[PDB]
Amino acid sequence: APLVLDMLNFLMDAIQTNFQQASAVGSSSRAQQALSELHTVEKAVEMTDQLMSQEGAFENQGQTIRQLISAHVLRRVAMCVLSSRQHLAEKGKITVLQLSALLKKLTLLASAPVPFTVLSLTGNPCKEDYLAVCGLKDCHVLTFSSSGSVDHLVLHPQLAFIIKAVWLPGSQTELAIVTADFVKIYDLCVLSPTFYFLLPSSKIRDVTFLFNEEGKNIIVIMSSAGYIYTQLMEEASSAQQGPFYVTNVLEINHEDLNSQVAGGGVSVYYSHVLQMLFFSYCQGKSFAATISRTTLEVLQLFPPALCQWSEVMNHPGLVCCVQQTTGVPLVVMVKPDTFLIQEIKAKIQDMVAIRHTACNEQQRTTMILLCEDGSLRIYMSYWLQPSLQPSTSGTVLERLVVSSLEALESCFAVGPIIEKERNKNAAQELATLLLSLPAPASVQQQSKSLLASLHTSRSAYHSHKDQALLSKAVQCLNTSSKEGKDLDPEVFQRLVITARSIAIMRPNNLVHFTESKLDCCSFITQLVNHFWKLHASKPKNAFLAPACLPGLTHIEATVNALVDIIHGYCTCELDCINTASKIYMQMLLCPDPAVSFSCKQALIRVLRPSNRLHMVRLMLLERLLQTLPQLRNVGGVRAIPYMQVILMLTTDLDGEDEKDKGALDNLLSQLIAELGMDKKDVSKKNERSALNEVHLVVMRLLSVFMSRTKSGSKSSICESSSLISSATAAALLSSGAVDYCLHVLKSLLEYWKSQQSPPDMSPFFLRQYVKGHAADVFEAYTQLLTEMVLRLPYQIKKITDTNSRIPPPVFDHSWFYFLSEYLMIQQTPFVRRQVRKLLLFICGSKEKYRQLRDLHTLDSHVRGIKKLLEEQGIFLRASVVTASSGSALQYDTLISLMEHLKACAEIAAQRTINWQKFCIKDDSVLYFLLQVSFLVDEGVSPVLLQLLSCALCGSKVLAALSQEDQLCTALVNQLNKFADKETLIQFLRCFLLESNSSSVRWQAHCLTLHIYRNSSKSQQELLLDLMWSIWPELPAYGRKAAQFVDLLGYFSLKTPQTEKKLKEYSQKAVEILRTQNHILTNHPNSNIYNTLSGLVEFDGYYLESDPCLVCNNPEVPFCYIKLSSIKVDTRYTTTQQVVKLIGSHTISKVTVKIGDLKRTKMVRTINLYYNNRTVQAIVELKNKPARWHKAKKVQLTPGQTEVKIDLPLPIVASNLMIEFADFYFLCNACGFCKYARFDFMLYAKPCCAVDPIENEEDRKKAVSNINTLLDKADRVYHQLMGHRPQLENLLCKQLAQEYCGDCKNSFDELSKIIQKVFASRKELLEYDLQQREAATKSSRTSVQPTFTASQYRALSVTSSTKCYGCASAVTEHCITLLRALATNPALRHILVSQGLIRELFDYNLRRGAAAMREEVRQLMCLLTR
């Protein structure tokens, strides 16, 4: 006891030295001292060596390269070591390998074919990822992938020799390449470098850059003349204002130091690891200097040529130069007071080295130096020792001290009370002094046990321990503070650890002591200030850091522990809180995420899990909310933590207390004012604004509030809602959020039209989207704002409807109009789904939903069609469609009209009541529609008729193939109101008789039927009069007019009227019948066909003089013919195939059948081009711009096997050109495509046309063509008229072969010629009238006559009278009509009084076919009933 203490009192004298010096305690002072001694104390060069597979393992304008390298100007270092991985590494291909086997007769990834002349390869120092492969005037930047396999972007040097390039220190994104006169620095982040410098004189020998006292860039070059020059690269010297002349030259006055510095310099290198720089000349002298951090004044200086020292990372003080002349690499290791230089057939070309881990997990440096024979050499701590590097078998001293602790423990536990108590005071003092300084952990344990025993109350042990230790730490820190000396890293760590431990143990006593006054708790604020300064002191780039690890080490852990301490001290004493808030806030807004994120996680863990804690929560909510205005410039990405914290405290928000409800009120009010729902200059929201980003974050916060659902118990009461949710609803409704949202959406309409480790940033911006767009989770401003401005009002409505008390919100019809406008503008799935839910909830009933969207669709489509036609001049006056130029529109206008109209047709197709309703809304749909169909091309007629027929006839009848009946009846009366009689006649004529199609005629019949069957009574009379009037000319439109006959008959037998009218009609019909009969009877061609019909199978009356065009154009059906079986010529190029088909065909569809597709190479998109322009040369029309008319842009999925491209209106084509538009392959000569094979077909029938007309060249060409065709037809005419003689001969007494052989084929030839001739005449007239109107347009007093639509149809581009077929067909139709109209008994009497029985029995008795004759007999029997 007394003797133990007696020896120990002396022992502590050096025991304190051992304990403080032990461990990392004492490392900081030793390191700083050694650094000072290195930079300050003199050293001497010492020659020594103790510091430190076969050849042929290696492979392989070089003359001028030899020249420059001989000039010693440049050299070769072909090596690199990419590791932070295990990557390490003439023919323009160098192999980059791994050396793992050597790492843990050699056993030694990928290779890269270098496309540039290579003298070296340099990895970026901050990041071994990118490597620059370096030559003189060509170099590359390669991002080798994870396995080392080759992307490469080849750097454009624009050489007018580039010495070398360096990626800026710690700047993995920056790099500069310097040549012999100028240096250009570019950032890979942003061709155009961001810096450029040049020299007023001499060459650029060596160029380096470093940091300032703050750390800013400075560029210093040892020139060719040796003049060392310095500059500060900023906005002035940057390449933005141009390459800058170098200005200042640093001074060195040594004994050795005339425009040529001792015969030139050698190099330049300013190590940041040593915090120094070296200097050397082509004289061959070496020296070392350290200079001021801002004055750059060389503070401390010390004294074959030299080149290219290299420091191994994680290997302090080790440098590897190479003698310029001797070629000899030399190693320099510098402790403070000496500079050991060591030198290590196989003429070493280069070397490499890395401080790696050997088989013993020991960081030993391995150096593989490469020779001239391909051989290798293996080569291999002053600052690297643990006592210099920041962090009982040991000390027999610690062993004896442990023995002493055992002795003291025994001398207490078995020692008497008297001795124990008498020695108590001194022993406790000694033990306190012992535990005071840092020492062994086992010493701490033994002392703690002994001292807790010594304290009779272990609570007293803890109390006295807290008081003493805290006082000691506080005094130490306060000395360091008033002193202003920088806090040692481990010092702050140890203090924070100790205080955190004591606070976690006994926070109340901690508050009492750290609060007792030996403002409030200045230790806390001073400690935080210390933390801020020290973190500001962090080594910026850890690579470029000085030999020590400056700044915090386990930074986030220190932050979390400090937060624990601060929160505890705040909790224990309430009156400090107003401070702590701001303190924490300055941290919860710090720049680097390492502070803010760690603090947010810390606090969330901190306040998490009586009334005391809730009160602390409320007070914090008030305090931070006041500082909420400070985030005005925070930046959204640098602001999510605050809101995460607000919600985090809001986790247990029970507003039930009047105070608690008041708290909710303050929160909601502050947030709402922060958003500012009443700005009214909302157009500023369009751009991405910092306050805008913060605002959006706040909105997402309020949304996580409203969407918060405090799901209750099993009870079905509708009032178990989150009080936070109810409040958010109430406040947003009070703030008029609807109008703000709507003004935002309208304001965004402009942009919408114009557009055509990861931090756990949950829950504001989700983790997945973080993974997907880690660039900036506040970057997608427009889309996120749109999503929010939608998804808020829906939830607002959810609460609003759900609340019994609150009357519902009211948004005006602008809501429907604007949201529907949003829907039609395209958007991705999220926007679409949200908008749909919004409209559906808003408009209540799904019927109303679909109806409203439909009406919008129709309104847009009609507006679009009207504007399209107006772009061609067509103008509706009030209800009078008028046109000025009557030309036919090109394909562009037609595809335009067809797209919109067909869309409308599909819409009306889904259901009819919608089309009926939309039409009932606007009275400007019908007459415009019919007027448009009257002028539009024929191929567009079927669609327009389908729509109009759906409108008036309706769904019941059309599908068959009261409310809707009323709609149809009213709309029929409407059409009656708007229609003009002349237009009605023009419609009947154009679409019932003249049309060539069958479906067109059928639909015409349906529309006429339904319109007539329901028009007004007197309207019915008007229609009957008009139709029976037009029937007088039925001879001309002739054989195609069956529909009109049927319609006239139905109208006749259904409608009763005055006998004068009926008599008039009967007179008309009888006269027509008689005249047609007579025209039949005197026919010169009557005899021959008359005889021949009863002899051979008479198919067609092939004995007409001027071919009846109506009889001469049957309806050839579209045949599904393969694109193979029509070809005439084919060819291919790199990516296209040109085929010249047999002849002009009207293609409506085409199908690509794909065989044996290649997974490596697929074609996604294809562009098809048609051309119907005259060409006999395959090469001539391969010009894509001239001879390609695009058809349909078709892109499919990869692997798609059957494609069906159908032109909306069929295209008339001759030469087709198919190109594989987009990919996901055609050979030059034969076009073999090893990807696959393709086949094609088309549902087409031939089309008889010519070349389109373009120029007077076409005028002469076509005139000649038509003339020649006329010659051919003339030969046909003479020869064919010749058959009449021999035909008469065979008639006099074979004939099958005679005419059925000849006459048929003859008529075939003449028909081909005639059809071609007519089409050609049409084309010539088209060009004539088009040039006429165009040249007439220039005349200004000549206002081009706006021709009516009827004038237009007659203006724009009939069976021949003496056609025995025409007369016969007229007879058949007339017989049908007569056998019909006789049915009225009064009509029986009237027709009998006509006495036509004579005419029929006499003229048409045996005429007509079998069926014709039989019907005739039936009629004759009937007429005398």
Curated annotation (Swiss-Prot):
Keyword Lipid metabolism among record annotations: no
CC per GO annotation: centrosome; cytoplasm; cytosol; endosome; ficolin-1-rich granule membrane; membrane; nucleoplasm; plasma membrane
Keyword Iron among record annotations: no
Subcellular location(s) of the protein: Cytoplasm; Cytoplasm, Cytoskeleton; Nucleus
Keywords: Acetylation, Calmodulin-binding, Cytoplasm, Cytoskeleton, Disease variant, Host-virus interaction, Metal-binding, Nucleus, Phosphoprotein, Transferase, Ubl conjugation pathway, Zinc, Zinc-finger
Gene Ontology MF terms: calmodulin binding; ubiquitin protein ligase activity; ubiquitin-protein transferase activity; zinc ion binding
Residues recorded as bearing Phosphoserine in the entry: S84
Single GO biological process annotation from the record: protein K48-linked ubiquitination
Taxonomic superkingdom: Eukaryota
Similarity section: Belongs to the UBR4 family.
Domain comment (free text): The UBR-type zinc finger forms a pocket that mediates recognition of type 1 N-degrons. In addition to substrate-binding, the UBR-type zinc finger probably positions substrate proteins in the proximity of the bound and activated E2-ubiquitin conjugate to enable their ubiquitination.
Record disease entry: Episodic ataxia 8: A form of episodic ataxia, a neurologic disorder characterized by episodes of poor coordination and balance. EA8 affected individuals have attacks of unsteadiness, general weakness, and slurred speech. Additional variable features include twitching around the eyes, nystagmus, myokymia, and persistent intention tremor. Inheritance is autosomal dominant.
Complexes and interactors: Component of the SIFI complex, composed of KCMF1, UBR4 and calmodulin (CALM1, CALM2 or CALM3). Interacts with E2 conjugating enzymes UBE2A and UBE2B. Interacts with RB1. (Microbial infection) Interacts with protein E7 from papilloma virus HPV-16, HPV-6B and HPV-11.
Stated role: E3 ubiquitin-protein ligase involved in different protein quality control pathways in the cytoplasm. Component of the N-end rule pathway: ubiquitinates proteins bearing specific N-terminal residues that are destabilizing according to the N-end rule, leading to their degradation. Recognizes both type-1 and type-2 N-degrons, containing positively charged amino acids (Arg, Lys and His) and bulky and hydrophobic amino acids, respectively. Does not ubiquitinate proteins that are acetylated at the N-terminus.
Name used for this protein in its record: E3 ubiquitin-protein ligase UBR4
Organism whose genome encodes this protein: Homo sapiens (Human)
